[PDB]
Structures are given as structure tokens and as C-alpha cells.
Amino acid sequence: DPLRPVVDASIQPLLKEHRIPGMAVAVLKDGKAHYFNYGVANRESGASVSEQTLFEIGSVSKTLTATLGAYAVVKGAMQLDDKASRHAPWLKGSVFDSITMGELATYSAGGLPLQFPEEVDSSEKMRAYYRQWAPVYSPGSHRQYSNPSIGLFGHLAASSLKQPFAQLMEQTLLPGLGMHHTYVNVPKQAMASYAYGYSKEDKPIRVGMLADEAYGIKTSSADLLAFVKANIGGVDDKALQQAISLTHKGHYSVGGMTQGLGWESYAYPVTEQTLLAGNSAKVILEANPTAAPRQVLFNKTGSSNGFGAYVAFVPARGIGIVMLANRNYPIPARVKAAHAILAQLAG
Ligand SMILES: [Zn+2]
Ligand SMILES: [Zn+2]
Ligand SMILES: [Zn+2]
Ligand SMILES: [Zn+2]
Ligand SMILES: [Zn+2]
Ligand SMILES: [Zn+2]
Ligand SMILES: [Zn+2]
Ligand SMILES: [Zn+2]
Ligand SMILES: [Zn+2]
Ligand SMILES: [Zn+2]
Incomplete structure (x- = not known):
């Protein structure tokens, strides 16, 4: 070569x-x-x-998750300016009524941390974590690279398409990409x-x-x-x-x-x-x-x-x-x- x-x-x-x-x-x-x-x-x-x-x-992985989110937008299941709680009833009544899907995707919701706290190790604890989370910055003003942020974006994009995330990726998106x-x-x-x-x-x-x-x-x-x-x-x-x-x-x-x-x-x-x-x-x-x-x-x-x-x-x-x-x-x-x-x- x-x-x-x-x-x-x-x-x-x-x-x-x-x-x-x-x-x-x-x-x-x-x-x-x-x-x-x-x-x-x-x-x-x-x-x-x-x-x-x-x-x-x-x-x-975040590029692939982002592509699923974009696919959900193209299919009309969600829009990037949707409030996050539109796609998660469990977020209704939290600050995620005032944070957008795009902000989650781009780590700009307001200071969600790099990683979940070590204690947040179950579904129930995760939902509690987001519902108690106190913004550090106004939405859109700061980038704090964050697994909880884009993780939630991908999770809610999957929910908007009414299928589990792993299934959407392995059965639809990835084979669609030739992967x-x-x-x-x-x-x-x-x-x-x-x-x-x-x-x-x-x-x-x-x-x-x-x-x-x-x-x-x-x-x-x-x-x-x-x-x-x-x-x-x-x-x-x-x-x-x-x-x-x-x-x-x-x-x-x-x-x-x-x-x-x-x-x-x-x-x-x-x-x-x-x-x-x-x-x-x-x-x-x-x-x-x-x-x-x-x-x-x-x-x-x-x-x-x-x-x-x-x-x-x-x-x-x-x-x-x-x-x-x-x-x-x-x-x-x-x-x-x-x-x-x-x-x-x-x-
Ligand atoms: Zn060589
Ligand atoms: Zn070659
Ligand atoms: Zn061995
Ligand atoms: Zn150069
Ligand atoms: Zn291009
Ligand atoms: Zn944006
Ligand atoms: Zn869920
Ligand atoms: Zn898993
Ligand atoms: Zn295949
Ligand atoms: Zn291959």
C-alpha cells in the first residue's frame, strides 16, 4: 500500500x-x-x-447517538427546540420543562456534570437525580461536556420513536448506515x-x-x-x-x-x-x-x-x-x- x-x-x-x-x-x-x-x-x-x-x-458513541436524535427529528417524532419533558413524563414539573432537546444534545443545558454521581446506579436513582438537579448556568450559555446530558438526549430520542434505544440502534440505524x-x-x-x-x-x-x-x-x-x-x-x-x-x-x-x-x-x-x-x-x-x-x-x-x-x-x-x-x-x-x-x- x-x-x-x-x-x-x-x-x-x-x-x-x-x-x-x-x-x-x-x-x-x-x-x-x-x-x-x-x-x-x-x-x-x-x-x-x-x-x-x-x-x-x-x-x-455520541456521534451515533446524535445521528439517532437527528433521525427522530427527520421522522417528525421530535424537534430540537422541544422541551425535554415533552418526551419524558417523569421530567414534568422539573427544570427540564425549560431545557431543550438540543441543549441536552450539545451539553449546554446548564452544568450537568461529566459523569453521573457514583451513587446514581439505577433507573429509580437516575430519575431522582435529574428531578433534583439544580442548574449552574442559564440554558444555552455554557458548554459542560456531559454523559448525563447527551445520554438523556439519546434516551428521549428513542422514546420519541417508541422503541428501546439498543433496538433502534442495532436493528434500524446502524444497519441503515452500513454498520x-x-x-x-x-x-x-x-x-x-x-x-x-x-x-x-x-x-x-x-x-x-x-x-x-x-x-x-x-x-x-x-x-x-x-x-x-x-x-x-x-x-x-x-x-x-x-x-x-x-x-x-x-x-x-x-x-x-x-x-x-x-x-x-x-x-x-x-x-x-x-x-x-x-x-x-x-x-x-x-x-x-x-x-x-x-x-x-x-x-x-x-x-x-x-x-x-x-x-x-x-x-x-x-x-x-x-x-x-x-x-x-x-x-x-x-x-x-x-x-x-x-x-x-x-x-
Ligand atoms: Zn512501515
Ligand atoms: Zn490501500
Ligand atoms: Zn481466559
Ligand atoms: Zn494543519
Ligand atoms: Zn455536511
Ligand atoms: Zn442548538
Ligand atoms: Zn427511560
Ligand atoms: Zn445496556
Ligand atoms: Zn446486520
Ligand atoms: Zn462490519
């Missing part, structure tokens, strides 16, 4: 520095998929990573393809409330590259195509990053500095005020215990990259490697 040396040059240093057991990389250019596989999915079996290996992609090996619940027949994650102590590990919606997808580099293709070349189904397009619209910005539904976007060519800043600890962990929204690059990071994922693509240039690893290695390393490889592809 004439792209192998370029991809290897940016990826092999990551593997060495962070002792990454395995990584599946996929690149799109000129309508063609290219797969570059490294190391092992499972240190016990020694099974090689391939483009069919399943990795936990963590928050990259037939993408799961919230990995079935028996797919378990042999499922990597283990590796913690910092090299312990094998795999993945709470709204996990499915917020961070629970297992998928392959082949399936995720198919999703990238869907986000560039499109899909056959008109409703899904319109849904995908809704996920590209900018809602607001934080520095040089523009927040949409799931995807976070940048003007392209993008400097490494701009891409690092929008993916920085400050943006991920702290509340930041929302500013007016901005060729475009779209991306999403995701991590779980033992896993580290990144996807970035540029529709105007027909290029994209997926990097799925079974080590949670630092986001800036992901960004720098992707930026370098994409720049080589862009020419």
Missing part, C-alpha cells in the same frame, strides 16, 4: 511510546478504504488486530472479535446509567470508516441522509471548535494548535461559555478504561481517518498523528 509508510510513520511511534497492545487504523481517500492494523486485540490469545476487530470507542458489526450489546457470535482493553497496569478490562447512549458502542475500524463514508458520500436512505446532514450543522463555538450534534468541527486546513485546543482538558473538563457558531473538518475523541479512539474527516476533500486502540493513550497524541496523516492525504 503506497499509504502504508505515511500511516506507519505517525502510528508506530504511538504504539512504542504508550506500549499500545493493538490498534486498527482505517483511512478513506478517493472513495477507497485502506486498513492498517497493528499488534494484538487480546494479549492472552495473541490474536492480531484486524479491521474486523471490535474496540470500545467510548464517547465516539452491521456495531453493537451496544456484543452478541455471542461476535465475542471472538472483541478486543480487551488494557489499563495502565496492563490488566485486561471491558466497560452505568445511560452507558448505551453516552459511551457504549463496540465497533470495528471497517464499520467506523463506513460511517465516515456515510458522512461524506452519503447513504441510500433519504431520511438517514438528512439525519447525517443535521449532525454537521454548527450550534455554537468554544474557541476555534464548533459544536454540533455529536460531531465537533473546525475550519480546514486546521492547525495542530487549534485542533489540540478544541480537544484540550479545558474544553473537555470545564464549563466554557458558548459563542456564535463558525472546508470543514469533523472529529470526535472517545476513551474508556483500557481503550482510546479517534475519528476525523474532511468531506470537501473526501478524506478521513479512524484510529481504534486498546490503550487509553493521551488525546493530544491522537490529534497530532491524525493531523499529520490527514495533511499527507490532502496534498
Whole structure:
């Protein structure tokens, strides 16, 4: 493969520095998929990573959940400016009478935290948590990246379509996107393809409330590259195509990053500095005020215990990259490697 040396040059240093057991990389250019596989999915079996290996992609799941939400909008089941309690009777009489579905989707409802409190570990406790939650910021004014926020968005989008979230994803949305090996619940027949994650102590590990919606997808580099293709070349189904397009619209910005539904976007060519800043600890962990929204690059990071994922693509240039690893290695390393490889592809 004439792209192998370029991809290897940016990826092999990551593997060495962070002792990454395995990584599946996929690149799109000129309508063609290219797969570059490294190391092992499972240190016990020694099974090689391939483009069919399943990795936990963590928050990259949010792009898929966002697409389901957009699909519900396209189907007329909900609108982004609906109050959240329209789709959850159990939220009636709370502050979620005054917070919109779009605000949940874009982490801007007013300071919902990164994670549920550890104690919130059941349906009953989760409903209680939202009903007692006290806003920190006015709706729309601040971005605080949040699993409870987008998790609730996805959960309520599923409810608006009158089906369970996992079923909608596995039976309708994901196969509609050409993603037939993408799961919230990995079935028996797919378990042999499922990597283990590796913690910092090299312990094998795999993945709470709204996990499915917020961070629970297992998928392959082949399936995720198919999703990238869907986000560039499109899909056959008109409703899904319109849904995908809704996920590209900018809602607001934080520095040089523009927040949409799931995807976070940048003007392209993008400097490494701009891409690092929008993916920085400050943006991920702290509340930041929302500013007016901005060729475009779209991306999403995701991590779980033992896993580290990144996807970035540029529709105007027909290029994209997926990097799925079974080590949670630092986001800036992901960004720098992707930026370098994409720049080589862009020419
Ligand atoms: Zn090489
Ligand atoms: Zn190739
Ligand atoms: Zn065993
Ligand atoms: Zn529910
Ligand atoms: Zn299928
Ligand atoms: Zn597949
Ligand atoms: Zn589940
Ligand atoms: Zn677009
Ligand atoms: Zn919005
Ligand atoms: Zn650049």
C-alpha cells in the first residue's frame, strides 16, 4: 500500500511510546478504504488486530447517538427546540420543562456534570437525580461536556420513536448506515472479535446509567470508516441522509471548535494548535461559555478504561481517518498523528 509508510510513520511511534497492545487504523481517500492494523486485540490469545476487530470507542458513541436524535427529528417524532419533558413524563414539573432537546444534545443545558454521581446506579436513582438537579448556568450559555446530558438526549430520542434505544440502534440505524458489526450489546457470535482493553497496569478490562447512549458502542475500524463514508458520500436512505446532514450543522463555538450534534468541527486546513485546543482538558473538563457558531473538518475523541479512539474527516476533500486502540493513550497524541496523516492525504 503506497499509504502504508505515511500511516506507519505517525502510528508506530504511538504504539512504542504508550506500549499500545493493538490498534486498527482505517483511512478513506478517493472513495477507497485502506486498513492498517497493528499488534494484538487480546494479549492472552495473541490474536492480531484486524479491521474486523471490535474496540470500545467510548464517547465516539455520541456521534451515533446524535445521528439517532437527528433521525427522530427527520421522522417528525421530535424537534430540537422541544422541551425535554415533552418526551419524558417523569421530567414534568422539573427544570427540564425549560431545557431543550438540543441543549441536552450539545451539553449546554446548564452544568450537568461529566459523569453521573457514583451513587446514581439505577433507573429509580437516575430519575431522582435529574428531578433534583439544580442548574449552574442559564440554558444555552455554557458548554459542560456531559454523559448525563447527551445520554438523556439519546434516551428521549428513542422514546420519541417508541422503541428501546439498543433496538433502534442495532436493528434500524446502524444497519441503515452500513454498520452491521456495531453493537451496544456484543452478541455471542461476535465475542471472538472483541478486543480487551488494557489499563495502565496492563490488566485486561471491558466497560452505568445511560452507558448505551453516552459511551457504549463496540465497533470495528471497517464499520467506523463506513460511517465516515456515510458522512461524506452519503447513504441510500433519504431520511438517514438528512439525519447525517443535521449532525454537521454548527450550534455554537468554544474557541476555534464548533459544536454540533455529536460531531465537533473546525475550519480546514486546521492547525495542530487549534485542533489540540478544541480537544484540550479545558474544553473537555470545564464549563466554557458558548459563542456564535463558525472546508470543514469533523472529529470526535472517545476513551474508556483500557481503550482510546479517534475519528476525523474532511468531506470537501473526501478524506478521513479512524484510529481504534486498546490503550487509553493521551488525546493530544491522537490529534497530532491524525493531523499529520490527514495533511499527507490532502496534498
Ligand atoms: Zn512501515
Ligand atoms: Zn490501500
Ligand atoms: Zn481466559
Ligand atoms: Zn427511560
Ligand atoms: Zn446486520
Ligand atoms: Zn462490519
Ligand atoms: Zn445496556
Ligand atoms: Zn455536511
Ligand atoms: Zn442548538
Ligand atoms: Zn494543519
